[PDB]
Ligand binder design. Structure first.
Ligand SMILES: [Cl-]
Ligand SMILES: [Cl-]
Ligand SMILES: [Cl-]
Length: 124
C-alpha cells in the first residue's frame, strides 16, 4: 500500500488525515514533531514514505528541517497551512513542494491531491 507521513503540530489534524487516507487504502503515520520523524528516517533506511504532508506553520520549526532532509530526493512534499495563509503558493514554489493545500479541506480535493502526488489513480 502507498505510505504517507504527516507532520503537523496539531494532533487532531494527523488523526483526521490518517483515518481519511485509510478509508481509501493509503497507510499513514503522523507526527506532531518534525524531529521525531527525522529521527526515524535516520535510524532505519527501511522507513521511507511515498509522500510527506508538512505543516509549514509549526510554531518553532515551520517544518524547515523536514523539508531540508527530503529536498532533492524521491519523497515529494505537500505543504499544508491554515485557511488564511495568503502566501502559501510562493512558499511552496521556492521550497520545491509538489503541491499545497489549505486546511480545512474537502475529501475530493484532498484525496485527488494526494493520489496525484503519489502517481496513483484517485478513488473520487
Ligand atoms: Cl486515529
Ligand atoms: Cl522540522
Ligand atoms: Cl530521501
Amino acid at each position: 500500500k502507498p505510505f504517507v507521513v504527516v507532520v503537523d503540530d496539531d494532533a487532531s489534524v494527523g488523526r483526521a488525515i490518517r483515518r481519511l487516507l485509510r478509508s481509501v487504502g493509503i497507510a499513514a503515520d503522523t507526527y506532531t514533531s518534525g524531529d521525531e520523524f527525522l529521527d526515524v528516517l535516520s535510524a532505519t533506511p527501511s522507513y521511507r514514505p511515498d509522500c510527506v504532508i508538512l505543516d509549514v506553520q509549526m510554531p518553532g520549526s515551520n517544518g524547515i528541517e523536514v523539508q531540508r532532509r527530503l529536498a532533492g530526493g524521491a519523497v515529494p512534499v505537500i505543504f499544508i497551512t491554515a485557511h488564511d495563509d495568503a502566501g502559501v503558493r510562493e512558499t511552496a514554489l521556492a521550497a520545491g513542494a509538489r503541491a499545497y493545500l489549505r486546511k480545512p479541506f474537502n475529501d475530493v480535493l484532498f484525496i485527488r491531491t494526494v493520489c496525484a502526488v503519489l502517481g496513483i489513480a484517485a478513488p473520487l
